[PDB]
Design brief:
Bound molecules: ligand A1ATF, phosphoaminophosphonic acid-guanylate ester, magnesium ion
Largest sheet of chain B: 6 strands, mixed
Strand content of chain A: 15-25%
Shape of chain B: globular
Structural class of chain B: alpha/beta
Keywords (chain A): Angiogenesis, ATP-binding, Disease variant, Kinase, Lipid metabolism, Nucleotide-binding, Phagocytosis, Proto-oncogene, Serine/threonine-protein kinase, Transferase
CATH architecture of the largest domain in chain A: Orthogonal Bundle
Strand order of the largest sheet of chain B: 2-3-1-4-5-6
CATH topology of chain B: Rossmann fold
Family (chain A): Belongs to the PI3/PI4-kinase family.
Strand content of chain B: 25-35%
GO molecular function, one term (chain A): 1-phosphatidylinositol-3-kinase activity
Order of helices and strands of chain B: EHEEHEHEHEH
Pathway (chain A): Phospholipid metabolism; phosphatidylinositol phosphate biosynthesis
Organism (chain A): Homo sapiens (Human)
Helix content of chain A: 40-55%
CATH class of the largest domain in chain A: Mainly Alpha
CATH architecture of chain B: 3-Layer(aba) Sandwich
Distance between the termini of chain B: 15 Å
Oligomer: heterodimer
Chain lengths: ~900, ~170
C-alpha cells in the first residue's frame, strides 16, 4: 500500500512508460482492474523460473545465449573451415590496468564452451610443470570456474551449445574473421548479477444465450459533440473479425444541427447464433452532395463494441461511448479492424445506445452445453483417394488464395477427415458459417483436440481473420510447445501487433509473451520497446500501458537500465524537436553551433552516456564522442552519433559505436523490410545458396523516431561515380578493383554478384520502389546492399552492375559468369516462393498497425503476382525469367 | 612507462616458445607444444630503463603463413631464431627477414639473430657462419640455450636496446 519500496517502484515504472501508474488506479473499468490483479501470477511464474537453478538460471535470464536455430552447418559453410576445425583466439586480463594476453587455438567447431576452456587449461598447464599436482590441483580448480565471453560486447557463452551455433562464431566463419573470446571467472559474473526483489503490489489484495427466442436489435438514442462544416447518419454492422455476420443497416438521415434518432435497428441474425467474438462496429457519416453534385459519404468518427464482455456476459441496457477520429483514410464508412472501446477524451462525439434488455443476465453457454449441442447436430446429420488428394491441394494454397464456395462446402463436409492434414485448419476455419451455432459448436469440438501444428502456421490463426477465442487459444498453445526463443525474437514484432486483435486485456497470447519477456531479457528488451513505441497511440495506450506496467513490475533490475535508455531517447527527441522548431530553416553550420552548445550541458551529457544501446542491449554506450557527432545531409536532420565502447577489450570488436538517430520519418516499414530481408537470407543460407544480405539494425522507439545502424566502409554508388567528373558506365568495376587488387579481386567479384542477386530478387518480390543510385551502397570488399525502404508493394539490373558481374567484358549478357548469376536468382526466387505462406502471414499480421502501405489485404496481394502463386512453379519461373531478362 | 613490442619468429621446433617461457616464469618445457600465435608480457629493468616487454610468440609451422603479415606490421623489433641442428633454419630465415623488410619497406628494421639449444653438445651449425650472416644483415647475434637460461636475457635485452637505437 504505502510501502516505501512500492512508492519508489511505482515512480520508476511511471518514468519508463511515460504515464504515472496512479492513472491506472483511477480507471473504474472492472476489466482493467481485473487485468492488473490477475496477470500477476505470470510475473510470479517467471520469477520462480529465474531463481530455479540460481545463480546460473539468473545469468541465463540476463545474458541468454544468442544462438542459431540449428547446430547443423550447411555444406557451403562447413567448407569454410580448415578440415572441420576453427581457429579461435582466447584472451584473458592480467594487470589491474586491463592488460591482456592471448592464446590462439585450433579446435573443432562442435566443441561446447567448456571443452574450449579445457583446451586452454591443457595448453597453460603444458607450459608449466608439476607431477600429481598439475592434474590434481590445477586441472580441478580451474575447471568450473571460468566462462567464455565475446570481446567487445556483453555476450556470454553460458550454455553448452556447440560453439559454431552461437551467432557470433557463425558470423566469423561466414566472413573469414577470427573469433576473439575472453575468459572470465563465473563468480566475477555472478557478483555483478542483480538481486531479485519481486513482491506482489498492493492492488493484488443466470440465463443462457441459446434460450433467447428473439432477433438482434439495437437502438441509437442520440449523439453529442458534433461540429458542422448537410445531414448525418450512423452506419452500423455486426462483425466477426473483419467479416460481417449480416447486412449493415443505417439510420434515417437527421440534420447535423440537432441529431436525434431513437430508432431500433434490426439485424438478420438470431441471438442464439451470435459467435463469441461477435462485435458491433458503428460510425457517424455525413452526406455532402446536393443541387448538381453527386452526394458524398464520409465517416466522421467510429467506434466498435464487444457484444460480450470479458465475463462472457451479453451486453444489455443503455450504453454510451465516445468515438475515435477517422483513421489514415479508410476503404469504407466502417472500421471493423479498429480497436474496441470508448474514447478516454470526452470532448469527442459521444453516441448513446441501448441494447435489448431480456429480464435476466445473459451469458455465453459453457463448453459442456456447446459440446452436447455439437453431438446433437452431428447425430441428426446421420476415404476416397480422389478427393483425398484434393484436400492436400487445398492445404498448399497460400493464405490469400480465393477458396471458392464449392471448395468451402467440400472442406466443411470432410471436416472429420481433415484432422489427418492438420495444416488445413485455417482453410477449414474460413469455410465455417460463424453465424450458425450448429456449425460453430461442431468446430469448437474439432479444434478442442486438434493436432498441434508448426509455429509458422499457427501464427496465421492470430491475425484479423480468426477472432474466435478457441481458435486463438489453440494457436497460443502451439507456440507454447514449439516456438523457441530464437524464433520468438524473430517474429516478435508480428506477435506484438496481433495483441490489438484480442478483444480482451486478459487473454492467453499476452500471458505467453509476458512470461517469455520476463524469462528472456533479450526478448523483454525489444518487447518493452515495441510496446513503448506505440504509447503515443491513444487507441492502444491503455492495453500496452497496463502490459508495460506488469512487465516493469517484475523485469528485475533491468528496469533501471531501461530508464537510462528512455531518458537518453527523450533528450534526443527534445533536442531534434527544438532543432526543427527554431533552426529548421537555418543552415547546417549554425544548426551545429546550436547542437554542440546544447550537448555540452551537464544534464544532457550525463543522460547520453553510460547506457545500453536500444538497437542491441549487448552494445554498451559510454562517453559521447561529440567531436564526431554531426547532423547528416537529409531532409529531417538525422543525428549521426558516436559513442566509445566501454568494454575492456573494445579494440578487438570496435572502439566506437556509431548510431543514426532519425526524428521525422516513419521507421515501421523499414523494420518490416529489414526483418523480411533477414528471413530471406536465412532461407537461402539453409539450402545452399550463399547470397549475403545486409539487414542492418533498425528500431522504432516512438512516433516517427528511431535508431538506424551505421554500416562501416560503405559507399553510395553515386559517391563512387561522383569521386570519379560526371557519370560513366565502367567506374564501378574500377573502384572495386582499386580497393581489391590481385588475388583478392576474384573474391570481391564473387561477393558482389551474390549480394546483387539476393537484392534483385528481394526488391522484386517485395516490390520496393524508387530504387536509384543513392539508394544502393557497396562495401569495400564488394558487398552490395540497399537502404531507405520507405515504400513497398506499390525489376532492377543496370549495365554498370552487369559489367562488374562479367568482370569487365563488353558482351556481359553472353558470359559464363552471367549464366551463373541468373541461375542464383532462379534458385533464390523459387526458394522464397516455397516459403510464400510465411511472408504472407507476416504481412497480414501487420495489418493491425497503422502503416500506410498495409491497410488491406489487396496491398498484400501484390506479392501474389510477383511470386505467381496462382500459376505453377514452372510457370512462375517462366514468369520470373521473362520479367528479369526484359532488356538488361 | 615505455613498452617494447617484440616478436619472436623462426621455424618450427627451433625453441622460440621455450625461449620466452624461460624468460618469464623461470621454467623449461620438454614437450613440443606447437604454437600458432601467443602473447606474453612482463616488466624488465634494462640500463635503468624499467620497461614493459610485449612478446608475440609466432607459429613455426608453414601451415599458418598467412598470419605473418599482421604481426610484422605491428612488431617494433623481431627476434629471428634458427636451430643449430637444422640447415633449413638458415635457409628460410632469409625469407623471414626479407619479408619483414617487405611489409616495412625500410631496409633497416630492429632484428637481432638468435640461435637456440647451445647447451646441446652435438651442434651442426658453425658459430662463424651465423656471425657472417649477422654482419651481412648489420645485426647482432646471441647463442642461447633455453634449458640452462644461457643468455636468454641477453638475446632479448639486445633487441630492447636495438629498438632504442632506432628510437
Ligand atoms: C584469471 O587468471 C588467469 C586464468 O587463465 C586461464 C584460465 C583457464 C585457462 C587458461 C588460462 C590462461 N592462462 N594464461 C594465459 N596467458 C598467460 C601466459 C603467461 C602469463 C605469465 C606472464 N606474466 O607472462 C600470464 C598469462 F595470462 C592465457 C591466454 C589465454 S587463456 C590463458
Ligand atoms: N635440450 C633442450 N631442448 C630444448 C631447448 N630449447 C627447446 N628445446 C626443446 O625443443 C622442442 C621445441 O620447443 P618449442 O619451444 O615448442 O619450439 P618452437 O620453435 O616454439 N615450435 P613452434 O614454432 O611450432 O611453436 C621442445 O621439445 C623443447 O623441449 C634447449 O635449450 N635444450
Ligand atoms: Mg555483436
Ligand atoms: Mg612454439
Amino acid at each position: 500500500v504505502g510501502n516505501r519500496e512500492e512508492k519508489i517502484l511505482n515512480r520508476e515504472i511511471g518514468f519508463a512508460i511515460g504515464m504515472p501508474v496512479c492513472e491506472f488506479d483511477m480507471v473504474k473499468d472492472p476489466e482493467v482492474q481485473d487485468f492488473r490483479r490477475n496477470i500477476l501470477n505470470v510475473c510470479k511464474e517467471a520469477v520462480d523460473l529465474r531463481d530455479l537453478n540460481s545463480p546460473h538460471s539468473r545469468a541465463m535470464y540476463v545474458y541468454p545465449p544468442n544462438v542459431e536455430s540449428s547446430p547443423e552447418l550447411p555444406k557451403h559453410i562447413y567448407n569454410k573451415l580448415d578440415k572441420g576445425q576453427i581457429i579461435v583466439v582466447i584472451w584473458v586480463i592480467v594487470s589491474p590496468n586491463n592488460d591482456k594476453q592471448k592464446y590462439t587455438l585450433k579446435i573443432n567447431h562442435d566443441c561446447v564452451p567448456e571443452q574450449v576452456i579445457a583446451e586452454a587449461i591443457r595448453k597453460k598447464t603444458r607450459s608449466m610443470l608439476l607431477s600429481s599436482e598439475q592434474l590434481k590441483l590445477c586441472v580441478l580448480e580451474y575447471q568450473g570456474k571460468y566462462i567464455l565471453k565475446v570481446c567487445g560486447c556483453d555476450e556470454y557463452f553460458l550454455e553448452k551449445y556447440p560453439l559454431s551455433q552461437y551467432k557470433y562464431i557463425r558470423s566469423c566463419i561466414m566472413l573469414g574473421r577470427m573469433p576473439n573470446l575472453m575468459l572470465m571467472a563465473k563468480e566475477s559474473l555472478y557478483s555483478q548479477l542483480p538481486m531479485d526483489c519481486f513482491t506482489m503490489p498492493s492492488y493484488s489484495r443466470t440465463k443462457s444465450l441459446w434460450v433467447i427466442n428473439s432477433a438482434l436489435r439495437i437502438k441509437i438514442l442520440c449523439a453529442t459533440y458534433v461540429n458542422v462544416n448537410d445531414k448525418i447518419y450512423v452506419r452500423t454492422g455486426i462483425y466477426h473479425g473483419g467479416e460481417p455476420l449480416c447486412d449493415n443497416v443505417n439510420t434515417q438521415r437527421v440534420p447535423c444541427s440537432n441529431p436525434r434518432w431513437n430508432e431500433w435497428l434490426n439485424y438478420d441474425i438470431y441471438i442464439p447464433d451470435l459467435p463469441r467474438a461477435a462485435r458491433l462496429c458503428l460510425s457517424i457519416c455525413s452526406v455532402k452532395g446536393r443541387k448538381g453534385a453527386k452526394e458524398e459519404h464520409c465517416p466522421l468518427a467510429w467506434g466498435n463494441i464487444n457484444l460480450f464482455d470479458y465475463t462472457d456476459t451479453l451486453v444489455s441496457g443503455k450504453m454510451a461511448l465516445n468515438l475515435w477520429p477517422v483513421p489514415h483514410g479508410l476503404e469504407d464508412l466502417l472500421n471493423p479492424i479498429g480497436v474496441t472501446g470508448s474514447n478516454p477524451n470526452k470532448e469527442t462525439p459521444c453516441l448513446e445506445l441501448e441494447f435489448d434488455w431480456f429480464s435476466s443476465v445473459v451469458k455465453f453457454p459453457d463448453m459442456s452445453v456447446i459440446e452436447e449441442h455439437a453431438n446433437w447436430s452431428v447425430s441428426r446429420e446421420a476415404l476416397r483417394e480422389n478427393d483425398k488428394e484434393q484436400l492436400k491441394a487445398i492445404s498448399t494454397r497460400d493464405p490469400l488464395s480465393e477458396i471458392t464456395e464449392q471448395e468451402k462446402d467440400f472442406l466443411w463436409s470432410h471436416r472429420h477427415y481433415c484432422v489427418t492434414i492438420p495444416e488445413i485448419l485455417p482453410k477449414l476455419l474460413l469455410s465455417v458459417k460463424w453465424n450458425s451455432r450448429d456449425e460453430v459448436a461442431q468446430m469448437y469440438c474439432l479444434v478442442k483436440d486438434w493436432p498441434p501444428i508448426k509455429p509458422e502456421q499457427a501464427m496465421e490463426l492470430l491475425d484479423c481473420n480468426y477472432p474466435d477465442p478457441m481458435v486463438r487459444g489453440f494457436a497460443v498453445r502451439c507456440l507454447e510447445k514449439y516456438l523457441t526463443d530464437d524464433k520468438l525474437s524473430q517474429y516478435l514484432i508480428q506477435l506484438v501487433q496481433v495483441l490489438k486483435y484480442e478483444q480482451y486485456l486478459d487473454n492467453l497470447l499476452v500471458r505467453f509473451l509476458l512470461k517469455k519477456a520476463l524469462t528472456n531479457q533479450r526478448i523483454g528488451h525489444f518487447f518493452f520497446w515495441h510496446l513503448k513505441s506505440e504509447m503515443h497511440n491513444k487507441t492502444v495506450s491503455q492495453r500496452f500501458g497496463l502490459l508495460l506496467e506488469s512487465y516493469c513490475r517484475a523485469c528485475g533490475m533491468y528496469l533501471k537500465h531501461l530508464n537510462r535508455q528512455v531518458e537518453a531517447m527523450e533528450k534526443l527527441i527534445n533536442l531534434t524537436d527544438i532543432l526543427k522548431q527554431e533552426k529548421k530553416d537555418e543552415t547546417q553550420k549554425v544548426q551545429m553551433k546550436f547542437l554542440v552548445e546544447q550537448m555540452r550541458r551537464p544534464d544532457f551529457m550525463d543522460a547520453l552516456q553510460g547506457f545500453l544501446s536500444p538497437l542491441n542491449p549487448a552494445h554498451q554506450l559510454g562517453n559521447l564522442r561529440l567531436e564526431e557527432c554531426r547532423i547528416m545531409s537529409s531532409a529531417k536532420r538525422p543525428l549521426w552519433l558516436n559513442w566509445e565502447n566501454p568494454d575492456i577489450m573494445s579494440e578487438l570488436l570496435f572502439q566506437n559505436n556509431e548510431i543514426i538517430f532519425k526524428n521525422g520519418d516513419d521507421l515501421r516499414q523499414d523494420m518490416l523490410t529489414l526483418q523480411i530481408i533477414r528471413i530471406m537470407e536465412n532461407i537461402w543460407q539453409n539450402q545452399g545458396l550463399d547470397l549475403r544480405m545486409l539487414p542492418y539494425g533498425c528500431l522504432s522507439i516512438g512516433d516517427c523516431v528511431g535508431l538506424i545502424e551505421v554500416v562501416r566502409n560503405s559507399h553510395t554508388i553515386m559517391q563512387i561515380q561522383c569521386k570519379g567528373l560526371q557519370f560513366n558506365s565502367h567506374t564501378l568495376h574500377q573502384w572495386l578493383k582499386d580497393k581489391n587488387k590481385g588475388e583478392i579481386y576474384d573474391a570481391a567479384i564473387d561477393l558482389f554478384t551474390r549480394s546483387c542477386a539476393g537484392y534483385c530478387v528481394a526488391t522484386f518480390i517485395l516490390g520496393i520502389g524508387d530504387r536509384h543510385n543513392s539508394n544502393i551502397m557497396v562495401k569495400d570488399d564488394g558487398q552490395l546492399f540497399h537502404i531507405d525502404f520507405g515504400h513497398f508493394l506499390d525489376f532492377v539490373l543496370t549495365q554498370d552492375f552487369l559489367i562488374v558481374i562479367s568482370k569487365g567484358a563488353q558482351e556481359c549478357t553472353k558470359t559464363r559468369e552471367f549464366e551463373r548469376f541468373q541461375e542464383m536468382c532462379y534458385k533464390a526466387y523459387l526458394a522464397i516462393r516455397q516459403h510464400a505462406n510465411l511472408f504472407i502471414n507476416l504481412f497480414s499480421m501487420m495489418l493491425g498497425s497503422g502503416m500506410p502501405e498495409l491497410q488491406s489485404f489487396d496491398d498484400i496481394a501484390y506479392i501474389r503476382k510477383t511470386l505467381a502463386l496462382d500459376k505453377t512453379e514452372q510457370e512462375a519461373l517462366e514468369y520470373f525469367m521473362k520479367q528479369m531478362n526484359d532488356a538488361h | 612507462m615505455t613498452e617494447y613490442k617484440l616478436v619472436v619468429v623462426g621455424a618450427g621446433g627451433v625453441g622460440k616458445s621455450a625461449l620466452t617461457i624461460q624468460l618469464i616464469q623461470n621454467h623449461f618445457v620438454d614437450e613440443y607444444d606447437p604454437t600458432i600465435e601467443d602473447s606474453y608480457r612482463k616488466q624488465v629493468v634494462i640500463d635503468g630503463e624499467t620497461c614493459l616487454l610485449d612478446i608475440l610468440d609466432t607459429a613455426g609451422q608453414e601451415e599458418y603463413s598467412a598470419m605473418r603479415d599482421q604481426y610484422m606490421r605491428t612488431g617494433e623489433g623481431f627476434l629471428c631464431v634458427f636451430a643449430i641442428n637444422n640447415t633449413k633454419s638458415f635457409e628460410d630465415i632469409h625469407h623471414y627477414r626479407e619479408q619483414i623488410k617487405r611489409v616495412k619497406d625500410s631496409e633497416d628494421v630492429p632484428m637481432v639473430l638468435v640461435g637456440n639449444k647451445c647447451d646441446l653438445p652435438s651442434r651442426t651449425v658453425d658459430t662463424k657462419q651465423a656471425q657472417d650472416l649477422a654482419r651481412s644483415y648489420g645485426i647482432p647475434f646471441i647463442e642461447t640455450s633455453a634449458k640452462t637460461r644461457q643468455g636468454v636475457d641477453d638475446a632479448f635485452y639486445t633487441l630492447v636496446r636495438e629498438i632504442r637505437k632506432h628510437k
